[PDB]
Amino acid sequence: MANKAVNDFILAMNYDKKKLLTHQGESIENRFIKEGNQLPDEFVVIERKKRSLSTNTSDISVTATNDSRLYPGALLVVDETLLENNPTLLAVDRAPMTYSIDLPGLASSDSFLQVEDPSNSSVRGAVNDLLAKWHQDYGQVNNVPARMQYEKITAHSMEQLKVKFGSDFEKTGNSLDIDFNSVHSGEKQIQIVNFKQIYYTVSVDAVKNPGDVFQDTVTVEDLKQRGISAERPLVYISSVAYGRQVYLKLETTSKSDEVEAAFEALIKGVKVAPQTEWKQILDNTEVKAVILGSGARVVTGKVDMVEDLIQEGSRFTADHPGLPISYTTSFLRDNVVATFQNSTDYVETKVTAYRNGDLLLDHSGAYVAQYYITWDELSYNHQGKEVLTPKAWDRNGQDLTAHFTTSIPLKGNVRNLSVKIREATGLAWEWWRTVYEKTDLPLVRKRTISIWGTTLYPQVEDKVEND
8 A cells, every 4th residue: 555655665765875974074274383392301392284084884872871762773864963963763653673682592583572663662671571581591690791892092173083983972072071272282192982892782684675664554655744855864773782881081191102002001901010101101191981881970080990990891781781882774775884974174283202311421531532512402493394503512622631520411302412532642643532423312311421541442331321
């Protein structure tokens, strides 16, 4: 009857593949800015570059504790509200649907549910009954691990993070209290980590006919009621992943290039030994977190809190059905995956710190010695151009005897450090002999160049203490 018209009507729905779900964020064009600022202990080089991030994915992350709309097999509009992950459901009258669940220990036939009139309470009711039986049958006498998924990203802008984690991330992100300002100023580095623990997945298998999803009751072709066209078409929820998920902000004041490594070591089981750079970074890291799966909670504190956050809910048991943490949609017409294409431009701030240092000289040789020590001071002008300003030790070329000592302060902007040391041999037609000569000397924390011995046999030590 009218459903035979629905089959071919939906099959006649002509809509643009991959394009109707495409959205793009804010835009900006390539502009070079590179500055160098002398902080009292470090020279800091900040480099900003236009970057783009694009994602194309099937999974939609759930941020709402109470679903109301995100039950499996729900039909949602393909609309502005869908892209922004705040969908609008069209509810009138639904036909029965079969579902499947991937729990281990379930005999094949028992993995299938048959729901009469699909709704939130309906489907969740079925699933919860099934689970109640499964926890006693299998769950409490077996050790079943949840499936674990990590995603992570360095934070630069809220739009970037929206593209990464979903268009409805902003509320959660606001709860994480992300200091984008300090990332832009080069004073902080921030990583966002999404951790998902999947207990089970309720999925809908292939739909033979597009009409099978419907009874025959009311407004069958008249379903053009409110905006259901080849321009504003329908989707159904192909699957919903249930479990627990955590959004984790790791925010450090370190300017080090070992931040990501330390964060990675932290997320894993690795315990970090003291007096390490990792240990210092993690000491200076603030942790914020949003836990889901009676609602979403905001916890805060130090790095040690991460372990627990990750271990909790690792084994699926009763006392919690888990909440929908993800869902995946497929178009009515065919097996078509509904992939969401998002992209945005963002400003990437890169920071490089150059530790200040000291060059110490000790002369205890039985000879006249001369030093020739030169370097460049690095600056960036207002056009971001590299400028090198030549500098020299003020006692260059002067005759020095034992026991001479000095300390030469070298800020982090020092480049092209050259040290040459020679001694007067007292020999006719070989008046000078080079004791030491190096160029491009690394600006370590503490370098001590000592010379001793005699005119004939001068000796030298180049001692590096970079701690």
